[PDB]
């Protein structure tokens, strides 16, 4: 919510923790592990009846929109 | 075998990497304009002219009886010999649209009248196909033949999509090679037929083909399933031993292993060939000539017109032939700043 | 996500369990896809959005089962395609562009018939019937001439691909009205129906005197283009 970048975050984190005797914020790795529960591809579900020509997999995340574009130079790039 | 740089005074925002060129009754027509037709010309087909080294583009028209065609991307081309019933015609099928899907429909383009005031008039008749219909695809090959002495056509080549069973919305833009079946196609009726011979080891795409006197030779292209580009030039001999349209196939030794070629007839059965792409990244460079007869196909390495540097460096390129040795090649004019006309053009002549 | 209502179990066609309180603030607008390609080419845009469109189609009928709040619950969706601007609106409806005889995205009337009457118009446009008109245009099962066929097909020239119920833009929604009232004032300082056809001189004259008048009484500078706040 404030564009705050990772290097910054870690810096001010060490800063405030070593500043006043406490752990106010959480370090990155654990914050991000906790995050992984908010992006797409984390909850199970089902669909009745099954979708038409849609991969039954459910755990995927950030995909590439080329959709497997056969990279052969000759054709449209 | 000389090259000279041309430029389009205008009408530059409208040439996609694929397109086709037909010649008939004098002038030459470009087909397959990028995106759908604007208001300027609802047909999309453009009369293309070279005037004093400049490139000019005017609009084309149609009759009322004409059936209107979308701007296919990279379909197959075929010339119907001028005779009864209507000389002459060009058969087009089927390529893909400004959207990603195939036509699976045969169309026949002809010229009707002129001028009056140096205008030209055409028409496009769709021909329904019954069968035993050929599968929709693109980048395949089609050619015309006469077997004692009846006139028909042969279809072979082209990739396609996975069936709507493994049609996967994460590979939904992947292509795969259609199985290697030859197809026989008459015009009236349009009853198509599917055939296969064991020497048809595999289908491929972008393999230029040619034929003479109802015998057809497929030249070099590229296979994706094995990532290779087989030098197998393929012969087949077709005959309608009425009422059985029987074919016989065979593999020949030498076929040039380049892909996506550009061809111009300098005479009756002679073809100067620019060729587009030999290897996976190294584009084709040489300039070849093909004669052909019952003796066979004879090949020669004609003099390659000495390219410029800016063309010698770009990755890919394309073009067509205005007719009779004449030809146009086009390179992505990748530079700064973008005009936005991103395509340089070279006129190229034989002898 | 716009709204959620109920359908169980009797008549109960809908109880709005949740309606969004402010759909405009980007705070609530979730992204789905990003593409480093201009809206210009139809090629790349269809190339990428194809999977998306086909998915949206395959997502209307079947019912989604969610493990929500500890319960396995069933979900159906209704889909509106709205947030497009006129340019792409056409570009995904198959109409020509831009200001030709066919002007209204809903009332397929032309300019002249919209000038005869201005409010008797029934919403007849729909994605399916436009698909049908495209088939009509391509086959031409009557072999009608070019322009006459384009008339009998009513704007449908290119196969549309993206079902989307368009709506009036709530953003501009005023700018043509603004320039119209502006022309009204400029031609009312003139006696335009007393001198029916004036040239550019009296045009610029009326403009300048009107703008000095507005600056004098309401204290507003003249402008070249009409944004929102100037119109307001
Ligand atoms: Zn209406």
UniProtKB/Swiss-Prot annotation, chain A:
Tissue expression remark: In the adult, predominantly expressed in the thymus with lower levels in the pronephros, mesonephros and ovary.
Cysteine pairings via disulfide bonds: none
Subcellular location: Nucleus
Family per record: Belongs to the RAG1 family.
Known role: Catalytic component of the RAG complex, a multiprotein complex that mediates the DNA cleavage phase during V(D)J recombination. V(D)J recombination assembles a diverse repertoire of immunoglobulin and T-cell receptor genes in developing B and T lymphocytes through rearrangement of different V (variable), in some cases D (diversity), and J (joining) gene segments. In the RAG complex, RAG1 mediates the DNA-binding to the conserved recombination signal sequences (RSS) and catalyzes the DNA cleavage activities by introducing a double-strand break between the RSS and the adjacent coding segment.
SUBUNIT field: Homodimer. Component of the RAG complex composed of core components rag1 and rag2.
This protein's domain notes: The RING-type zinc finger mediates the E3 ubiquitin-protein ligase activity. The NBD (nonamer binding) DNA-binding domain mediates the specific binding to the nonamer RSS motif by forming a tightly interwoven homodimer that binds and synapses 2 nonamer elements, with each NBD making contact with both DNA molecules. Each RSS is composed of well-conserved heptamer (consensus 5'-CACAGTG-3') and nonamer (consensus 5'-ACAAAAACC-3') sequences separated by a spacer of either 12 bp or 23 bp.
Protein name: V(D)J recombination-activating protein 1
Organism, as annotated: Danio rerio
Boundaries of the shown chain within the full protein: 492 to 568 of 1057
């Amino acid at each position: 919510n404030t564009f705050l970048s990772c290097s910054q975050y870690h810096k001010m984190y060490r800063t405030v923790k070593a500043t006043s005797g406490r752990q106010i914020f959480q370090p990155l790795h654990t914050l991000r592990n906790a995050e992984k529960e908010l992006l797409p591809g984390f909850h199970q579900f089902e669909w009745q009846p099954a979708l038409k020509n849609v991969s039954t997999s459910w755990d995927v995340g950030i995909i590439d929109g080329l959709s497997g574009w056969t990279v052969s130079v000759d054709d449209v790039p | 075998m000389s090259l000279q740089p041309l430029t389009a005074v205008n009408c530059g925002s409208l040439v996609q990497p694929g397109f086709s060129l037909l010649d008939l009754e004098g002038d030459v027509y470009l087909f397959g304009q990028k995106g759908w037709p604007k208001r300027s010309c609802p047909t999309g087909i453009f009369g293309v002219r070279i005037k004093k080294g400049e490139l000019k583009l005017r609009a084309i028209s149609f009759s009322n009886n004409s059936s209107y065609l979308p701007p296919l991307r990279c379909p197959a081309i075929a010339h119907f010999e001028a005779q009864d019933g209507k000389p002459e015609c060009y058969l087009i099928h089927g390529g893909r649209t400004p959207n990603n899907e195939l036509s699976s429909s045969l169309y026949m383009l002809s010229v009707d009248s002129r001028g009056c005031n140096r205008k030209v008039t055409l028409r496009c008749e769709e021909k329904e196909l019954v069968g035993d219909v050929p599968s929709a695809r693109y980048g395949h090959t089609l050619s015309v033949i006469n077997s004692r002495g009846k006139t028909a056509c042969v279809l072979f080549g082209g990739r396609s999509y996975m069936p709507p069973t493994e049609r996967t919305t994460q590979n939904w833009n992947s292509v795969v090679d259609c199985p290697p079946q030859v197809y026989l196609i008459d015009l009236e009726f349009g009853c198509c037929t599917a055939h296969t011979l064991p020497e048809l080891t595999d289908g491929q795409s972008f393999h230029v083909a040619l034929a003479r006197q109802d015998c057809v030779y497929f030249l070099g292209g590229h296979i994706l399933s094995s990532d290779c580009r087989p030098s197998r030039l393929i012969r087949l001999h077709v005959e309608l031993l009425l009422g059985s349209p029987v074919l016989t196939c065979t593999i020949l030794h030498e076929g040039l292993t380049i892909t996506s070629a550009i061809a111009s007839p300098i005479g009756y059965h002679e073809y100067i060939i620019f060729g587009g792409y030999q290897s996976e990244t190294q584009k084709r460079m040489e300039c070849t000539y093909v004669g052909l007869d019952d003796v066979g196909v004879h090949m020669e390495s004609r003099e390659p017109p000495q390219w410029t540097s800016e063309i010698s460096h770009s990755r890919t390129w394309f073009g067509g032939s205005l007719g009779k040795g004449t030809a146009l090649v086009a390179i992505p004019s990748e530079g700064n700043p973008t005009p936005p006309e991103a395509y340089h053009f070279y006129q190229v002549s034989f002898q | 996500i716009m709204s959620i209502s109920i359908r169980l179990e009797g008549e109960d066609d809908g109880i709005t369990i949740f309606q969004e309180q402010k759909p405009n603030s980007e705070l609530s607008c979730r992204p789905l896809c990003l593409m480093f390609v201009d809206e210009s080419d139809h090629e790349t845009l269809t190339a990428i959005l194809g999977p998306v469109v086909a998915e949206r189609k395959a997502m209307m009928e079947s019912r989604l089962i969610i493990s929500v709040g500890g319960l396995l619950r069933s979900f159906r969706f209704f889909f509106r395609g709205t947030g497009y601007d006129e340019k792409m609106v056409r570009e995904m409806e198959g109409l020509e562009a831009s200001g030709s005889t066919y002007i209204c995205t809903l009332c397929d009337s032309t300019r002249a018939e919209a000038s005869q009457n201005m409010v008797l118009h029934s919403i007849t446009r729909s994605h399916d019937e436009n698909l049908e008109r495209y088939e009509i245009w391509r086959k031409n099962p009557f072999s009608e001439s070019a322009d006459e066929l384009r008339d009998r097909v009513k704007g449908v020239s290119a196969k549309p691909f993206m079902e989307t119920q368009p709506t009036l833009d709530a953003l501009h929604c005023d700018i043509g009205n603004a320039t119209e009232f502006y022309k009204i004032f400029q031609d009312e300082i003139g006696e335009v129906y007393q001198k029916p056809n004036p040239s550019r001189e009296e045009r610029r004259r009326w403009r300048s005197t009107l703008d000095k008048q507005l600056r004098k009484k309401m204290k507003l500078k003249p402008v070249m283009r009409m944004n929102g706040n100037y119109a307001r």
